[PDB]
UniProtKB/TrEMBL annotation, chains A, B:
Keyword Nucleotidyltransferase belongs to the record: yes
UniProt key word Signal: no
Family to which this protein belongs: Belongs to the retroviral Pol polyprotein family.
Keywords: Aspartyl protease, DNA integration, DNA-binding, Endonuclease, Host endosome, Hydrolase, Metal-binding, Nuclease, Nucleotidyltransferase, Protease, RNA-directed DNA polymerase, Transferase, Viral genome integration, Virus entry into host cell, Zinc, Zinc-finger
Protein name: Pol protein
Section of the entire sequence shown: 1 to 99 of 404
C-alpha cells in the first residue's frame, strides 16, 4: 500500500490474537503498545525521558501483523497515549518514506 | 527520494534563508520549528496538551524547502525538543508511506 498523509496514518495490527489500531510513527524509534499480556520472558526498558522515564516491558521476536504484513519484532508493552508503530517495525515491513 | 527508516529520518530544510535540520515526523499533525524570526503577521496557536499546552506562533503560507522540494505552508514557531516536519508539509511535498 501507499498511504497518503492527509489524515493520521492509523493502521490495523494483529498482535497476540487481538486486532488493534496503532499509528505509523516515523518520529518514534520503537514500537509501544498499551497493556497486552504477551507470553514469555521480557526485560525492563525505560522509554520517554522528558520530565522522567516510563518503565515498559521489552518483548523480542514477537510475531505481529501490520496491514496483513507478517513481521517479527521487539514490542514494548505498558502505558502510552495510544499504540504506536515505530521505525523498528516499519523497516521490517519494508515501509519507506517517498516523495 | 526514497528514505528508509533504519535511522531517524532527519532532513535538511531551508527556511527564511537559513539551512536547518528537522525530523520527518508522520506522528506529528503539524510542523514545529525552534526560534526563527519569520516576518509578518501570525496568530497564537496552542500545541502539546499533555500536562498542559505550549504557545507557539502560527505563520501561514510560508515558503519552505525540504530536500530541495519547494513548498508553501503553515509553520508553528517557538519551543520544541528539535525542529519537526509534520504531515501538513509532507502532503505538500507529496511524501507518502510505502510498503
Amino acid at each position: 500500500p501507499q498511504i497518503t498523509l492527509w489524515q493520521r496514518p492509523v493502521v490495523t495490527i494483529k498482535i497476540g490474537g487481538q486486532l488493534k489500531e496503532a499509528l505509523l510513527n516515523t518520529g518514534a524509534d520503537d514500537t509501544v503498545l498499551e497493556e497486552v499480556n504477551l507470553p514469555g520472558r521480557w526485560k525492563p526498558k525505560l522509554i520517554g525521558g522528558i520530565g522522567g522515564f516510563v518503565k515498559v516491558r521489552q518483548y523480542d521476536q514477537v510475531p505481529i501483523e501490520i496491514c496483513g504484513h507478517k513481521v517479527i519484532g521487539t514490542v514494548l508493552v505498558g502505558p502510552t497515549p495510544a499504540n504506536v508503530i515505530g521505525r523498528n517495525l516499519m523497516t521490517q515491513i519494508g515501509c519507506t518514506l517517498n516523495f
